[PDB]
Design a protein around this ligand. Structure first.
Ligand SMILES: C/C=C(/C)C(=O)O[C@H]1C(C)=C2[C@H]([C@@H]1OC(=O)CCCCCCC)[C@@](C)(OC(C)=O)C[C@H](OC(=O)CCCCCc1ccc(/N=N/c3ccccc3)cc1)[C@@]1(O)[C@H]2OC(=O)[C@@]1(C)O
Ligand code: NA
Length: 981
């Protein structure tokens, strides 16, 4: 049954054809099981380790490296023990990344799997095969089963309550909405078919816990058809878009594949003269090997092997840094999307305010005389739940007992209240026991002390519930009509130890409309026009004005109906029992905003981040609270920038999307509205942060770019969110967004640094193949630089001091490329220099170097013909063309250039003369280690044979410096162009 809440208990039994006493027959269970399936959510389609490994090798760049490794293995097979080092190192990189990926997925947690912790293992049913109850597996429960639940039981399916075998039935529905008080259930049907779950007073939802009582019911839906099952299907459908940087890697990969292939065509076209080369000759087996080991070098030089290690280590350190600021980020790639947040949708009571109620104002009727009227407004000091306060009128201490209207006012707050106070010695602070708005009333009557009781000598524990207990002795709480959203009030039936009385509290409009009289001290006066208008006017002054208070109308029924003429089980008749009331007074309490929220809203204004408030208050107070914390101006018109649940649904889908682009406040939203607002924001390409703390909020948290859960929220809300606020404070979001922009600012820099190095390395290898020179750089050397020599200053670039105007700029566009425009031309000139500096360095030692054999450029270009001992050759040893020394010139030039290029990466356009290189201390320290590591591989005896290197003379290093140092001069010239032109 889709709408079993709207059907009577007889209609539900008639639908399935099951008796409440006998239960489903064995043949009915057979057919109901085949029709509706088993009472369980679908299992996770877990990927195999093989599936992950394939995923690791699905990336094009990884595939290129694997191909290069294979070519290297073959070349090593047909070539010195060092030969197979190159294949192994490449493979080790790939293997490690895969292991990292596998570990990441294993650590990852799935919210849908979390939903299964709310699936009980067992369930109690009544079936026709046995007379007594049967405790079967909850998986085997089918719709139409007669199910019994009691205290401690977890509800196994969506159950329509048939009969409550106890006095009352209280259910803990906290998994749906978060930390909440138990809800009373009944058996009468709910008229509205489109009613929300909060109003389904006759339904037991799967996963909830029975707080107290015992009832018999009939199963309405099972599996994915339950309310918790519908939420799973919404989460399954939600697709997680790749972070902008992840998409850029996909872009950089496919564009790099085109350049590598076009270079292979370019080298073939440049060396097309080999078609006119004679046929007889052994240089063809050497030629194919020459271009194959250049292809391996071309792949290593193009791919930044160390970039993922530097990226994942900067995000991991930023997560530890955010954790000290109470921001628990779960996914590392989501830190980039955190700095890109454009709209923040936040709840109020948990995040924007402290959720610590306290009565601040109250008024009782002072005098009614025809058209004249006067009230007795009061002020209450003390913002905590402690009974330490003072009642004031016109800022003057008063004794509350001297006013008779306050005596009846306090008895309502003490009796029409299900909460209490309690003192904790481990913290020395009075704590809350129950609802926050009800605990404020118990604290209020303690500050009043309307009976002038002596509490000075009472202990702190006794002081907490002392004046309340006195009032509790005077009257006897017979029964309680619980709160319901249709009448928005609750009442209690009391008798003395004079006839009986009823004390009512609730929303002002509903309670005052049911008042026919007005309490004036101890007398009674009929409710008239000018009195009701004076009362309702002060209601709007406290709820809409600067006070932003939540008002509660308090009334009594001096002549309640007879006890036998009342039915305490019909929740629909509760409003009829709460009629013909006498207005006593109104109590207004404040949910104060946090201290750091007002400044955090202004930081979002300076950073171009829009804040949207989501409350449960009426539209008048929600707009008033927005004007208080800074969402709206005090005199700013907000006719089309604030909506409610009914207002938003009464709009067509066209005007709903237009409303979400200008709205900054949503009051009393339906459960589906959070996911609808996210989609409308995403339709405008907004990066939306959404808050929530229950399974109801779980689909909206996954749909939003960044779900934000509460540290005190449910486990499902945390597993569904990208960030968890440890202190539930809204300011943690702004601090996490600020840190997200700061991380990406430094992250943008070392990416450009490592990428520009790969550009210069390719130009170096393209010049080697286009001219026919010996290999100036070997893939083993390039891997050592791209992983270690350049990876250390890249990590150091992640610690660059952040800009002082980060929160003064609009959020970054996700489609903004890292390198484009004039910067794209810079790294071409820089890369064109590195490629020419390294190739020219190795060609120097071969040609103009005194320490090295002078050789003609033709000989160097035609060095593969040395074997002939041609007359064109001078009989020079052919082994010279394989000498180690020249590869050290190209390597030391490349290393020193990247050390200089790392200094130029401290700023995009600012000069080093203006922003000095010693701004980042970690960058200078990383350069020292990287250079020392260069000497380690140059001098420590095992390493240079592995890297095919030899030490350089003090004269040779000066040649490296005069070739590498002009990089700073070249890059400063390019920076000087962007600044002044
Ligand atoms: C890398 C080396 C070379 C030689 C190359 O071809 O690079 C070109 C290239 C692909 C781009 C271009 C480059 O084009 C040129 O330089 C053309 C010069 C021609 C000169 C001819 C002289 C005769 C770029 C380089 O030109 C310059 C001059 O910088 C600029 C730009 O690139 C980026 O902005 C970086 C995004 C990073 C994204 C983040 C990222 C993180 C980790 C990554 N891998 N982790 C791995 C780990 C393990 C395994 C594998 C990977 C990869 C990326 C782009 O145009 C880019 O193709 C694009 O679509 C843009 C918008 O991305
Ligand atoms: Na999400």
């Amino acid at each position: 049954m889709e709408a079993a809440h709207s059907k009577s208990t007889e209609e539900c039994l008639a639908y399935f054809g099951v008796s409440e006493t006998t239960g489903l027959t064995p043949d009915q269970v057979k057919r109901h099981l085949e029709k509706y399936g088993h009472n369980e959510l679908p299992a996770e389609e877990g990927k195999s380790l093989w599936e992950l490994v394939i995923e690791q090798f699905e990336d094009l760049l990884v595939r290129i490296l694997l191909l290069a490794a294979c070519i290297s293995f073959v070349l090593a097979w047909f070539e010195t023990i060092t030969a197979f080092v190159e294949p192994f190192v490449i493979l080790l990189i790939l293997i490690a990344n895969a292991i990292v990926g596998v570990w990441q997925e294993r650590n990852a947690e799935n919210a849908i799997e979390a939903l299964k912790e709310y699936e009980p293992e067992m369930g109690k049913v009544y079936r026709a095969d046995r007379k007594s109850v049967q405790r079967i597996k909850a998986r085997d429960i089918v719709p139409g089963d007669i199910v019994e639940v009691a205290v401690g039981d977890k509800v196994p399916a969506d159950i329509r309550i048939l009969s409550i075998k106890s006095t009352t039935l209280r259910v803990d529905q906290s998994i749906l909405t978060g930390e909440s008080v138990s809800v009373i259930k009944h058996t009468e049907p709910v008229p509205d078919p489109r009613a929300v779950n909060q109003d389904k007073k006759n339904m037991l939802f799967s996963g909830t816990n029975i707080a107290a009582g015992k009832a018999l019911g009939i199963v309405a839906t099972t599996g994915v058809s339950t309310e918790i099952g519908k939420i799973r299907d919404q989460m399954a459908a939600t697709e997680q878009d790749k972070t902008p940087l992840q998409q850029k890697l996909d872009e950089f990969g496919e564009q790099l594949s085109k350049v590598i292939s076009l270079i292979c065509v370019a080298v073939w076209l440049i060396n097309i003269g080999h078609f006119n080369d004679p046929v007889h000759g052994g240089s063809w087996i050497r030629g194919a090997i020459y271009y194959f080991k250049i292809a391996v070098a071309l792949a290593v030089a193009a791919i930044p092997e160390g970039l993922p290690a530097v990226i994942t280590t900067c995000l991991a350190l930023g997560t530890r840094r955010m954790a000290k600021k109470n921001a628990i980020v779960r996914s590392l790639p989501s830190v980039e999307t955190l700095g890109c947040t454009s709209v923040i949708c936040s709840d109020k009571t948990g995040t924007l305010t402290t959720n610590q109620m306290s009565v601040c104002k109250m008024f009782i009727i002072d005098k009614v005389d025809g058209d004249f009227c006067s009230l007795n407004e009061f002020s209450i000091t003390g913002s905590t739940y402690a009974p330490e306060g003072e009642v004031l009128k016109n800022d003057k201490p008063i004794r509350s007992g001297q006013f008779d209207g306050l005596v009846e006012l306090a008895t309502i707050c003490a009796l029409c209240n299900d909460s209490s106070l309690d003192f904790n010695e481990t913290k020395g602070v009075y704590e809350k026991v129950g609802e926050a708005t009800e605990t404020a009333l118990t604290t209020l009557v303690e500050k009043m002390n309307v009976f002038n009781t002596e509490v000075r000598n009472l202990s702190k524990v006794e002081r907490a519930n002392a004046c309340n207990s006195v009032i509790r002795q005077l009257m006897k709480k017979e029964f309680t009509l619980e709160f319901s959203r249709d009448r928005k009030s609750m009442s209690v039936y009391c008798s003395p130890a004079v006839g009986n009385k009823m004390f009512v509290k609730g929303a002002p409009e509903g309670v005052i409309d049911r008042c026919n009289y007005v309490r004036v001290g101890t007398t009674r006066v009929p409710m008239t026009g000018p009195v009701k208008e004076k009362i309702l006017s002060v209601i709007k002054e406290w709820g809409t004005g600067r006070d932003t208070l939540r008002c509660l109308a308090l009334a009594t029924r001096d002549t309640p109906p007879k006890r036998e003429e009342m039915v305490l089980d019909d929740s629909s008749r509760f409003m009829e029992y709460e009629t013909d009331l006498t207005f006593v007074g109104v109590v207004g309490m404040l949910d104060p905003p946090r201290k750091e929220v007002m400044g955090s809203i202004q930081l979002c204004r300076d950073a171009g981040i829009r804040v949207i408030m989501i409350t449960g208050d009426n539209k008048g107070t929600a707009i008033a609270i927005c004007r208080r914390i800074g969402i709206f101006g005090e005199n700013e018109e907000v006719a089309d920038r604030a909506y409610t649940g009914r207002e938003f649904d009464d709009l067509p889908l066209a005007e709903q999307r237009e409303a979400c682009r200008r709205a900054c406040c949503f009051a009393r939203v339906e459960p589906s509205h959070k996911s609808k607002i996210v989609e409308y924001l995403q339709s405008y390409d907004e990066i939306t942060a959404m808050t929530g703390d229950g399974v109801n909020d779980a689909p909206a948290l996954k749909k939003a770019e960044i779900g934000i859960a509460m540290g005190s929220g449910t486990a499902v809300a945390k597993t569904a969110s990208e960030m968890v606020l440890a202190d539930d404070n809204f300011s943690t979001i702004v601090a996490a967004v600020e840190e997200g922009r700061a991380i990406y600012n430094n992250m943008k820099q070392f990416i450009r640094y490592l990428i520009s190095s790969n550009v210069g390395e390719v130009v170096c290898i393209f010049l080697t193949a286009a001219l026919g020179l010996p290999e100036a750089l070997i893939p083993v050397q390039l891997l050592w630089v791209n992983l270690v020599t350049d990876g250390l200053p890249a990590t150091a670039l992640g610690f660059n001091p952040p800009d002082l105007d980060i929160m003064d700029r609009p959020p970054r566009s996700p489609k903004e490329p890292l390198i484009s425009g004039w910067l794209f031309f810079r790294y071409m000139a820089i890369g064109g220099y590195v490629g020419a500096a390294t190739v020219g360095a190795a060609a120097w030692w071969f040609m103009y170097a005194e320490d090295g054999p002078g050789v003609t450029y033709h000989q160097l270009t035609h060095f593969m013909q040395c074997t002939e001992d041609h007359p064109h050759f001078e009989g020079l040893d052919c082994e010279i063309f394989e000498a180690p020394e020249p590869m050290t010139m190209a390597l030391s030039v490349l290393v020193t250039i990247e050390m200089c290029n790392a200094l130029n990466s401290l700023s995009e356009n600012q000069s080093l003369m203006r922003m000095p290189p010693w701004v980042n201390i970690w960058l200078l320290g990383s350069i020292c280690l990287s250079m020392s590591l260069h000497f380690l591989i140059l001098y420590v005896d095992p390493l240079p044979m592995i890297f095919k290197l030899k030490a350089l003379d003090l004269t040779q290093w000066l040649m490296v410096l005069k070739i590498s140092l002009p990089v700073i001069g070249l890059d400063e010239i390019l920076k000087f162009i962007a600044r002044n032109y």
